[PDB]
Each structure stands twice: as C-alpha cells, then as structure tokens.
C-alpha cells in the first residue's frame, strides 16, 4: 500500500520518481506526490524526448518559441529548464524541511559534452545557475572527465548526479574527487553543508548484458551483487578516518542511488530492483510503473546488507566465467551515452 514509502524512509532510503514532464508539474500530481512519500525527481535526455512528444502541453510552448530565433538546443533548454524549475519549486518544502538531504530534481548536461571536462563544468554551471534553484542538482556522466567536472563543480558549491556508473572503481574515483572538493572548500573556509552529490548506478542493465549466457544459478543476481559490493565499498570509503575529518566539519557523504531499476526481464518479479536495494543513506529512482507495482505489492526490508557473503561468492564466479566487469561497465556506460544522445537528437528535430 502507499505507506510503503514510508516505511522505506524509515529503513533510510529516499525513493525519487525517474520521470518529469510538464504535465506531472502543472497537474499537481508531482505536488501529491511529494506529501505520499516520493522524495525527488530525476531526469535524463530520454525522459525529456518521451515526454516532449507525448505531453500535449509542449505544444503552445513549442510554438512560442518557433517565433524566436533560437537553436534547437536551446528550445529544448528553455522547455527543460522551466519544467525542472517548476518541479523544484513543487519540492522545495520537502527539500527545506530535512535541511537540504531531499528533494531534489536533477538535470543532464548535454551528451556531446561527457568526455570534455571544462566544457562539461561551463554547461553545468550555467544550467544551475538558470534553474536558480537551490534543490536542482546536475547531473553528469561518470567518465574520466565527468569526474574531473565533479570535482570543479563541488569545489563551486554545485550539488551533482554524477550517473551511468557502471564500476565500483570508478565510484570509488568519484569519491576520491568529491573528497578533493570538499577539503578545497573547507581550505577556503567556504561552506559544504549543502552541498549534496548522489553516486548513479544503473542497474538492469547489467542484467540484460550477461543473463543470456550465464548459467542458471547466477541469472538475474549480477547487478544486485555489484550494487550490495559497491554499498560495502561505500561503508568503508565514508568511514574511514579522511573523510571523517571532513564530514566532522559539516561534510555530506555522497549517497549510493539505484536508477535502472525498472525490471526488463518479464521472468523476474517486477519489484526485484527496489525490493533487494533498500538500505541506509540511499536513494532509488524509479520509473512510474514500477513505483506503483512497488506500492501495490513492492515488500520494506533491509535487504541491500543481507547475505554480502553470497554476492561476493557471485562475483568470483561472474570473473571465473571471465567475465570482467570493469570492461562490462566500460562498455555499458559508453552504450548508455550513445542510447541517450540518440534520444537528444530526435528530440531536438521537431524544434528546429
């Protein structure tokens, strides 16, 4: 029932909606959402390109702004931009009542921009600062350059979604660089209280990349084993006594956040992602029918640390097969950059 989400707030994970369109805000249906539980939004160019083509509001904005000389691209902003700035708004008291750790609505820098890491900084920091909204997060690809961006961007004060994690050492490289900015700030006595950044980490997709081939016993059980690693990985990175020193000056631990969480296999139940995730000072992002398939017959449990022993044992059995993940998640991050400026394209063609 609705008060699941809840009692997943209880067990400390926050559940976001992996959707936004100009509808959902204006209806006041994001606006419900967020007194039954829903505790953010994310956004991502294939969202935008769904939404644009089936919401008929666009169709009196598009039309505005067809008798304005501007490029696609920033047609496409301004629509953007005004739709995650309504739905900050929608937000901002769930945002302002936990002190700035909800509520937030991310918004993707331009693909073409993911292995350039200053033009990546210049773009994000000029969407926030279009939003003008302090819960807007923006939300950059974790390639090498990503992370270079992340640091830049922390130590400017900009809340980030760094996304298409696919790799526990790339997440750990996230970190290290989150880290790097937040110790620039304090250095410069500059504040870092409410400075928030989520670590993405897609999982179905994983899933649909290896289950074919895997033998019985391991299909369907790949990416939960790397998300429970990776949330290991996690206990011991913010732990451990450096960043301890920091978070004791007002530093926010980076949080873990599942996206890609819809189920794709039609033989796996369709809350197995949310169901097997739940855990401490997380985040789950879920498109909209698996947020309804979770309330109706989704289960609350703590289960993202039960049985870490076993998906170990998975692991060194996905490496005894020879599969390397670090070249899987290489491999899924560029293909989810490819998928995702695809879907850029075709949604800036109808606003040229």
Same mark, same amino acid.
């Given at each position: 029932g609705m008060t699941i989400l809840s009692d997943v707030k209880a067990l400390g994970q926050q559940i976001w909606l992996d959707n936004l369109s100009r509808s959902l805000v204006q209806s006041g249906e994001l606006a419900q959402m967020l007194k039954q539980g829903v505790c953010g939004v994310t956004s991502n160019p294939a969202i935008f390109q769904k939404a644009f083509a089936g919401d008929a509001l666009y169709a009196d904005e598009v039309a505005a702004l067809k008798r304005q000389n501007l490029s696609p691209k920033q047609r496409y902003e301004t629509m953007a931009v005004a739709?995650?700035?309504?739905?900050?708004?929608?937000c901002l008291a769930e945002h302002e009542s936990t002190g700035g750790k909800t509520g937030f609505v991310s918004l993707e820098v331009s693909p073409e921009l993911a292995k350039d890491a200053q033009g990546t900084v210049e773009e994000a920091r000029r969407l926030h600062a279009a939003i003008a909204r302090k819960n807007?997060?923006?939300k950059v690809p974790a390639t090498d350059?990503?992370?270079? +961006? %992340?640091?830049?961007?922390?130590?400017?004060?900009?809340?980030?979604?760094? !996304?298409?994690?696919?790799?526990? *050492?790339?997440?750990?490289?996230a970190y290290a660089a989150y880290a790097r900015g937040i110790a620039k700030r304090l250095a410069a006595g500059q504040s870092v209280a409410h400075i928030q950044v989520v670590a993405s980490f897609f999982i179905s997709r994983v899933d649909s990349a290896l289950d074919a081939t895997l033998p019985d016993?391991?299909?369907?059980?790949?990416?939960? +084993? %790397?998300?429970?690693?990776?949330?290991?990985?996690?206990?011991?990175?913010? !732990?451990?006594?450096?960043?301890? *020193?920091?978070?004791?000056?007002?530093?926010?631990?980076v949080q873990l956040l599942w996206a890609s969480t819809?189920?794709?296999?039609?033989?796996?139940?369709?809350?197995?992602?949310?169901?097997?995730?739940?855990?401490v000072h997380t985040v789950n992002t879920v498109p909209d029918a698996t947020l309804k398939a979770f309330i109706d017959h989704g289960t609350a449990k703590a289960t993202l640390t039960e049985s870490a022993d076993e998906a170990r044992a998975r692991l060194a059995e996905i490496a005894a097969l020879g599969i390397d993940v670090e070249t899987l998640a290489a491999r899924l991050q560029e293909d989810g950059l490819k998928q995702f400026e695809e879907a850029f394209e075709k949604l800036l063609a109808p606003l040229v």
């Open positions: 739709d995650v700035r309504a739905a900050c708004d929608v807007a997060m923006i350059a990503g992370i270079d +961006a %992340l640091e830049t961007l922390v130590s400017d004060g900009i809340s980030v979604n760094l !996304t298409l994690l696919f790799s526990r *050492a790339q997440t750990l490289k016993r391991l299909k369907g059980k790949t990416a939960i +084993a %790397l998300a429970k690693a990776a949330y290991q990985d996690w206990e011991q990175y913010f !732990t451990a006594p450096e960043f301890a *020193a920091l978070e004791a000056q007002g530093a926010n631990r819809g189920v794709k296999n039609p033989a796996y139940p369709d809350t197995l992602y949310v169901d097997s995730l739940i855990g």
